[PDB]
């Protein structure tokens, strides 16, 4: 049969499948195992390289989604189900996919590795929004995406113990990164030009591979979309991780060795049934089992590592969307709903601030309220609704992104920053949510170029601009086209000028100040306050 | 009596007075200067409340200004008009409780509304005889009856050992009240209507006006109030009884002194000796802080000014309040390193933080950090021009603009009729540097109508502008409304409300309505900083 779909990696032979993109065919290799299935005795354990196989392994199908929590808030609603697993759940899930142009590239091609998001408790590399078909066909890119263990199976930790050291979900990603080093050349990819890019928890994971040295020799450039390793949600301390793991074992009827042995004896859903019951406070944008500051993978807190690291030969692309926190409000904040316009009172606004900032003392809570209050219209329900979205967005994404971009730029790194402001015509969420958390991904991957999904012609051309931005950054470390000269260049973000650009259908517009005033409150003041308590 | 001007002889409760016919740009005015309204608070009466003036025999000559109350004299810029125009222009003496009256010439037939001026000067300086307080223009052009009194300042007016009998405190405010009583009894002899008495003052005079609003024995002596760049509430206008006692007992130590024995010693000290040590009793290195100010004594002020404006009914009451564009720039050249009137005062970020500790002397390390980060321009956090302007805004907002914004909001929500303004025009005659903008107190010369005097080298637009302000002030005195019913062709001045927060801009252009008086920044000063200062 077709030899273009027959590849030999270090573990055996694979059979790909020629898929059809709007502009031509592409070779896809879906479901390649990169690790032994972490089942039974290997639950909570670091992954290990997949053993070789005999014959021709069929790599034409998406494998199983890592066992994870499934959303139940809006059943049947496209806005939530598009992130739900599209394959059967299983702890046997350490598989990756490779897209490449058809025919296989003649020259070594830069590789983009996608790390999906989902709050470290959900997500899969098989969702339609992560379809590397278009980037491989239009830009000739070799695109890689891997599944990593999420939730308890990927990040339940009893720090110091050996049967649950923590961060094994991140170690899954690193093992797939080494698999790319050892095998992507057989697909036409260049192992010396590997760019990691991910969104939300995937962006945070990308940032942690920057801050973990064994991972750094596996990639060269990074893209962090709406997520950072630093911040209030991406990591936990060893003491808090041990508390949540112990409380989870108590809720399921379970010396560290004997405790984890008991945890290895329960169905996967038994653990998922109680993973949301370990958070210390009523919260939104807080996740139970996330990466842990273990002194191993993360030698110190992300804030400490970005404050003192040498990033001179690293190039990064960071950015946010226009409404980072609007999505999260309907998941625990009284007065918000996707169906009504969520015009809240003021008493609701303060009650929501205690949920959006669950670590804030009463004084720190008031400081947030008085800061985001429009003191000319202190009770106009439209602003307090929009302000509540801004509190969660700025606290968890925007200002953590601003602090990271400044620290990287200050210590040698080459930083490009953006804000994504276009709202998709196909969006099914209400308009008061604006551009919600994660709705730039479909444009980066080039989905508007599929005529069957009913995007506007300008959205189709907008997606092409973003694909060229990302691939140019992967090819060169610079998102600017070295072909098209043209009036406005995307300038590097610096600590002095603080320049970033806006990604919408209008041409590039350079702005200065990534919410410098508001993020000064979050990054500089509020740490000193949560200290006066 | 016999060969004199019959239009200039008046009798008051204490005897007869001979006024003087003064010349104004567009006609003559009657002036009665140096009318004694109290027994000289000298000797054993130092620090004591004022007593009413015992009647005199014969005709008292009321043709020249009397003595200025003993006070500190500013000598930071010798011979510089910007500082000299506020210095005493008469002899310094503890014998200083005298007031002045300006009326049209001849004196009006029907009763005329009365404007009473209370000067400012941080409760340590000031005089009713300064040229910028000349009431001849308001009396000639607007036909108003203007009164201004001298009150004791500094230690002589506000040194207090609360609870004692020999130094009860607030005697400088009692000097003002006694003059308001003098107006109630005697202003009818000049053509003034004692049932239409409007108080107006600036800086500490505006604070004094506010304290008469919050003190009941004074509130029966007037009907309307104007507060220019000053409030009874705020960080500088008052001190607690314990702090006033501490500053008073410390000053006594610094000059060589049971309260009775202590004050008996202070009364034996020369007046200049108290002035020489007046500034040595401040708790910290500070600007816009004054050693001896009104004390919360549970008597004149039953509670703090903040407590009384929060719990007080003001439905009966119309006020005009406002600020100038640069309230704090004046005070920076008086203690903040890096600022001078002779250079551009471009400062570094380090000097900006050093100044924040001086401008906010009561702030902890954390509170001072909140001010610095709030006022920092994070796109140019080391630009010396913004840092210098931020330092001016910190002092101006903390001491004036936000206390005024706090006062207008509380009074309006409690039923009062409030009109608010921001004075934005810089006098073409200003001798201060341009970077100071419109400094503290440089709207007074326009409200009193000094640009009408042709010899003062003002522009013609400034003369027209001054006339427009005089009518704003006098219409509010006449009606409780600065607006003109004789002219609907000019834009109207809406009251300040909690809903709309409307105020107007006072400059060389027609009235322009604005919303919110620095709402975001003053929420930090008025709402957040007090709560954080509890830590
Ligand atoms: C790549 C990012 N996409 C995937 C995640 N998606 C939302 C899913 C629901 N979210 C929660 O925090 C969940 O909160 C709760 C869930 C269950 C329970 C019981 C309580 C709270 C927020 C994010 C946004 C877009
Ligand atoms: C009512 C009109 N205002 C009267 C006062 N005038 C300025 C006079 C000097 N100032 C001081 O803070 C002086 O403080 C000190 C004096 C002496 C010493 C030794 C230290 C500080 C600032 C205000 C502005 C206009």
Using alpha carbons only, give the angle B315, B320, B324 rounded to the nearest 5 degrees. Answer: 145
Give CA–CA dist A487/B494, Å, rounded.
Answer: 49
DSSP readout, B111-129? Answer: -EEEEEEE--STTT---TT
Give CA–CA dist A530/A532, Å, rounded.
Answer: 6
Provide the 3-class DSSP secondary structure of residue B329.
coil
Q: Which ligand has the minimum distance to the alpha carbon of residue A330?
A: 1
Whether A118 lines ligand 1, by a CB cut-off of 6 Å, is yes
Which letter, b or e, does each residue of A318-352 get, where b requires 16 or more Cβ atoms within 10 Å of its Cβ? bbbbbbbbbbbbbeebebbebeeebebeeebbbbb
Nearest to B508 by CA among B474, B477, B467, B475: B467
- Is the sign of the CA dihedral B493, B497, B500, B501 positive or negative? positive
Whether A437 lines ligand 1, by a CB cut-off of 6 Å, is yes
For residue B354 the two structure tokens come to 């050093």
Whether chain B has a CB inside 8 Å of the CB on A513: the answer is yes
**Inter-residue contact B46 to B94 (CB < 8 Å):** yes
Q: Is B523 close to A375, i.e. CB distance below 8 A? A: yes
Q: Which residues contact A423 (CB under 8 A, 6 or more apart)?
A: A322, A431, A434, A435, A439
How many Cβ pairs within 8 Å bridge chains A and B?
42
Residue nearest to atom 23 of ligand 2 (CA): B331
Domains located in chain A, CATH noted: 1-533 (3.40.50.1820)
Cβ–Cβ contacts within 10 Å for residue B1, how many?
Answer: 8
Rg (CA), chain B: 23
Q: Which residues contact B261 (CB under 8 A, 6 or more apart)?
A: none
Strands A142-146 and A95-101: antiparallel
DSSP readout, B235-281? Answer: SSS-B-HHHHHHHHHHHHHHHT--HHHHHHHHTTS-HHHHHHTGGGG
Whether A291 lines ligand 1, by a CB cut-off of 6 Å, is no
Q: Which residues in chain B touch residue A363, judged by CB atoms under 8 angstroms apart?
A: 531-532, 535
Whether chain A has a CB inside 8 Å of the CB on B533: the answer is no
Q: Which residues line ligand 2 (CB under 6 A)?
A: B 74, 86, 120-122, 202-203, 279, 287, 330-331, 334, 440-441
Residues in chain A followed by a break, C to N above 2.5 angstroms: 254
Which letter, b or e, does each residue of A495-519 get, where b requires 16 or more Cβ atoms within 10 Å of its Cβ? eeebbbbbbbeeebeeeebbbbebb
Cβ–Cβ contacts within 10 Å for residue B435, how many?
Answer: 18
Nearest to B167 by CA among B235, B315, B266: B266
Q: Is B520 close to A363, i.e. CB distance below 8 A? A: no
Instruction: Spell out the SS3 assignment of B179-199.
Output: HHHHHHHHHHHHCEEEEEEEE
Rg (CA), chain A: 22
**Given the structure tokens 């093992």, which residue do they identify?**
A175
Give CA–CA dist A263/A242, Å, rounded.
Answer: 14
Provide the 3-class DSSP secondary structure of residue A302.
helix
Give CA–CA dist A129/A117, Å, rounded.
Answer: 12
Residue nearest to atom 6 of ligand 2 (CA): B121
Instruction: Spell out the SS3 assignment of A49-92.
Output: ECCCCCCEEECECCCCEECCCCCCCCCCCHHHHCCCCCCCEECC
Whether chain A has a CB inside 8 Å of the CB on B379: the answer is yes
Q: Which residues in chain A touch residue B535, judged by CB atoms under 8 angstroms apart?
A: 363, 532
Helix (H) or strand (E) holding A355: helix A346-356
Q: Which residues contact A341 (CB under 8 A, 6 or more apart)?
A: A385, A430, A432
Cβ–Cβ contacts within 10 Å for residue A258, how many?
Answer: 9
Question: Where on the phi/psi map is residue A483: left (φ > 0), alpha (ψ -120 to 50), or beta?
Answer: alpha
**Inter-residue contact A437 to A328 (CB < 8 Å):** yes
Give CA–CA dist B466/B454, Å, rounded.
Answer: 13
Q: How far is the CA of B359 from the centre of ligand 2 (A)?
A: 14
Give CA–CA dist B172/B94, Å, rounded.
Answer: 12
Q: How far is the CA of A203 from the centre of ligand 2 (A)?
A: 57
Nearest to A436 by CA among A330, A345, A518: A330
CA of B338 vs chain A CAs: smallest distance (Å): 25
Whether A328 lines ligand 1, by a CB cut-off of 6 Å, is yes
Q: Which ligand has the minimum distance to the alpha carbon of residue A125?
A: 1
For residue B102 the two structure tokens come to 């300006």
For residue A450 the two structure tokens come to 């599929």
As to burial, measured by CB atoms within 10 angstroms (0-12 exposed, 13-18 middle, 19+ buried), residue A211 is buried
Cross-strand bridge partners of residue B149: B99
Provide the 3-class DSSP secondary structure of residue B59.
strand
CA of B497 vs chain A CAs: smallest distance (Å): 11
**Inter-residue contact A60 to A28 (CB < 8 Å):** yes
CA distances from A314 to A219, A222, A478, B271, B516 (A): 10, 8, 12, 73, 47
Select the residue of B378, B515, B527 nearest A370 (Cβ to Cβ): B527
What is the separation of C-alpha A296 from the centre of its chain, rounded to a whole number of angstroms?
22
Q: On the CB side of A267, how many CA atoms lie within 13 Å of its CA? A: 4
DSSP A399: H
Give helix B171-186 / helix B204-214 axis angle, nearest 10°.
Answer: 70
As to burial, measured by CB atoms within 10 angstroms (0-12 exposed, 13-18 middle, 19+ buried), residue B130 is buried
**Given the structure tokens 């207008």, which residue do they identify?**
B408
DSSP readout, B393-453? Answer: HHHHIIIIIHHHHHHHHHHHHTT-EEEEEEE-PPPTT--S-GGG-S-TTTTHHHHTTGGGS
Resolution (A): 2.7
Which letter, b or e, does each residue of A131-144 get, where b requires 16 or more Cβ atoms within 10 Å of its Cβ? bbbbbbbbbbbbbb
Cβ–Cβ contacts within 10 Å for residue A296, how many?
Answer: 13
Select the residue of B373, B515, B531 nearest A525 (Cβ to Cβ): B373
For residue A128 the two structure tokens come to 């339609």
Determination technique for this entry: X-ray
Give CA–CA dist B192/B459, Å, rounded.
Answer: 33
DSSP B360: S
**Inter-residue contact B238 to B291 (CB < 8 Å):** no
Provide the 3-class DSSP secondary structure of residue B177.
helix
Give CA–CA dist B150/B132, Å, rounded.
Answer: 15
Q: Which residues contact B58 (CB under 8 A, 6 or more apart)?
A: B15, B16
Whether chain A has a CB inside 8 Å of the CB on B442: the answer is no
Provide the 3-class DSSP secondary structure of residue B388.
helix
Nearest CA in chain A to B379: A513
Q: Which residues in chain A touch residue B409, judged by CB atoms under 8 angstroms apart?
A: none
Which letter, b or e, does each residue of A99-122 get, where b requires 16 or more Cβ atoms within 10 Å of its Cβ? bbbbebbeeebbbbbbbbbbbbbb
């Amino acid at each position: 049969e077709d030899p273009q779909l027959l590849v030999r990696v270090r573990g055996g032979q694979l059979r790909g499948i020629r898929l059809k993109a709007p502009g031509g065919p592409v070779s896809a290799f879906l479901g390649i195992p990169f690790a032994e299935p972490p089942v039974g005795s290997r639950r909570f354990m670091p992954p290990e390289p997949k053993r070789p196989w005999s014959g021709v392994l069929d790599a034409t199908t998406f494998q199983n989604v890592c066992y994870q929590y499934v959303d139940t808030l809006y059943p049947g609603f496209e806005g939530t189900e598009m992130w739900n697993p599209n394959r059967e759940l299983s702890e046997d899930c350490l598989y990756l996919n490779v897209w490449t142009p058809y025919p296989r590239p003649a020259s070594p091609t830069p590789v983009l590795i996608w790390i999906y998001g989902g709050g470290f408790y959900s997500g899969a590399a098989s969702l339609d929004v992560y379809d590397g078909r278009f980037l491989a066909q239009v830009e000739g890119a070799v695109l890689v995406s891997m599944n990593y263990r999420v939730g308890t199976f990927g990040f339940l930790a009893l720090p110091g113990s050996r049967e649950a050291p923590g961060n094994v979900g991140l170690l899954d990603q690193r093992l797939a990164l080494q698999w790319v080093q050892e095998n992507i050349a057989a697909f036409g990819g260049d192992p010396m030009s590997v760019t990691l890019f991910g969104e939300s928890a995937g962006a945070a994971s990308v940032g942690m591979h920057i801050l973990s040295l064994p991972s750094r020799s596996l990639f060269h450039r990074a893209v962090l979309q709406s997520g950072t390793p630093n911040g209030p949600w991406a990591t936990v301390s060893a003491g808090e991780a041990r508390r949540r793991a112990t409380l989870l074992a108590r809720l399921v009827g379970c010396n560290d060795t004997e405790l984890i042995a008991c945890l290895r004896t329960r169905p996967a859903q038994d653990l998922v049934d109680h993973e949301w019951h370990v958070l210390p406070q009523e919260s939104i944008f807080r996740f139970s089992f996330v990466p842990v500051v273990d002194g191993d993978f993360l030698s110190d807190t992300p804030e400490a590592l970005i404050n003192t690291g040498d990033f001179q030969d690293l190039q990064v692309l960071v950015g946010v969307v226009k409404d980072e926190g609007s999505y999260f409000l309907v998941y625990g904040v009284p007065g918000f709903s996707k169906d009504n316009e969520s015009l809240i009172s003021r008493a609701q606004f303060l009650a929501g601030v205690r949920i959006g900032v669950p670590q804030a003392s009463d004084l720190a809570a008031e400081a947030v309220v008085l800061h985001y209050t429009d003191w000319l219209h202190p009770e106009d329900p439209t602003h307090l609704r929009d302000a509540m979205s801004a509190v969660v967005g700025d606290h968890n994404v925007v200002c953590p992104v601003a602090q990271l971009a400044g620290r990287l730029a200050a210590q040698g790194a080459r930083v490009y920053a953006y804000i994504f402001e276009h709202r998709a015509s196909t969006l099914t969420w209400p308009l008061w949510m604006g551009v919600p958390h994660g709705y730039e991904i479909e444009f980066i991957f080039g989905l508007p170029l599929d005529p069957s999904l009913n995007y506007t012609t300008e959205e189709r051309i907008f997606a092409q601009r973003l694909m060229k931005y990302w691939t140019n950054f992967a090819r060169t470390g610079d998102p600017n086209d070295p072909r098209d000269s043209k009036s406005p260049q995307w300038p590097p973000y610096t600590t002095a000028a603080q320049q970033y650009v806006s990604l919408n259908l209008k041409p590039l517009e350079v702005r200065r100040g990534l919410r410098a005033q508001t993020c000064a409150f979050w990054n500089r003041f509020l740490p000193k306050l949560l200290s006066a308590t």
